[PDB]
Amino acid sequence: VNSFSGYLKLTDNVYIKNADIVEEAKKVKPTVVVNAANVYLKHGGGVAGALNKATNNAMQVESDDYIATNGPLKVGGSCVLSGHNLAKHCLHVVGPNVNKGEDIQLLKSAYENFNQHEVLLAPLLSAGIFGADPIHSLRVCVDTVRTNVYLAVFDKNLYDKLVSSFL
Ligand SMILES: O=C(Nc1ccc(C(=O)N[C@H]2c3cccc(O)c3C[C@@H]2C(=O)O)cc1)NC1CC1
């Protein structure tokens, strides 16, 4: 049993809710919240910008030190950093950004990072300002992630479309 509330069950292991991932993280304090990161961990907008704002920029400060030491992530890769006031840990995962021409096949590799964590709160990777089709992202999620994932979809119209079109 876990504290995630109001989710629709899509499969054995994937759950979905119309919710602001920031507000959901603040309320559940999950072990892992996933950030929709870029390779530079520059949390300017979209989900990343929102999560970072909720940490009063502490996520960005920590991220800048990480990059200065380790260099950029790979598209499809991830790193575990602090969850600050939102979660125990933040898994920063880089999905391909279609508005940069990145290969959409890398989306499966990005979701594979979730399998290193038993339970996660997450957005749909490569959705929103990353330019991919969220219906496709949900399909890849379901077909790749085997651990227990609680997906937060900010837009109600999109949430309803994702549920109603789910096979
Ligand atoms: O701003 C906020 N929350 C806030 C929450 C989510 C987003 C956002 O863009 N999410 C989408 C995104 C962005 C980038 C890549 C992606 O794959 C996705 C899928 C995500 C989705 O479809 O849900 C933006 C803002 N809270 C403050 C207190 C009011």
UniProtKB/Swiss-Prot annotation:
**Compartments, record wording:** Host endoplasmic reticulum membrane
Domain (Macro): residue spans on this chain: 1-167
Topology in the lipid bilayer is annotated as: Multi-pass membrane protein
Activity-regulation annotation: Inhibited in vitro by GRL-0617.
Give the reaction(s) catalysed. Answer: Thiol-dependent hydrolysis of ester, thioester, amide, peptide and isopeptide bonds formed by the C-terminal Gly of ubiquitin (a 76-residue protein attached to proteins as an intracellular targeting signal)
Q: What is this protein for, i.e. what is its function?
A: Responsible for the cleavages located at the N-terminus of the replicase polyprotein. Participates together with nsp4 in the assembly of virally-induced cytoplasmic double-membrane vesicles necessary for viral replication. Antagonizes innate immune induction of type I interferon by blocking the phosphorylation, dimerization and subsequent nuclear translocation of host IRF3. Also prevents host NF-kappa-B signaling. In addition, PL-PRO possesses a deubiquitinating/deISGylating activity and processes both 'Lys-48'- and 'Lys-63'-linked polyubiquitin chains from cellular substrates.
Quaternary arrangement and interactors, per the entry? May form homohexamers. Interacts with N protein.
Protein name in the entry: Papain-like protease nsp3
Q: Please state which portion of the whole protein this structure contains, as first and last residue out of the total length.
A: 1025 to 1191 of 7096
